[PDB]
Amino acid sequence: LKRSNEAKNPWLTGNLVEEANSQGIIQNRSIFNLFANTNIYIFFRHWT
């Protein structure tokens, strides 16, 4: 683009993934979570 112009794992924690909104599959959710390392979170704390 410069050249051109896991199995058998039930839900147990519940709290970690905030989203338990809908049965089966949530269809339209504003809510979005980013899972991060240390060097992602620090880059984000330097942004806030």
SS3 content of the chain, % helix, strand, coil (to 5): 15, 0, 85
Resolution in angstroms comes to 3.7
CB 27 within 8 A of CB 14: no
The structure's method of determination equals cryo-EM
Distance CA 25, CA 22 (A): 6
Structure tokens at 31: 């809510």
Helix extents (H) in the chain: 38-45
Count of helices and strands (H, E) across the chain: 1, 0
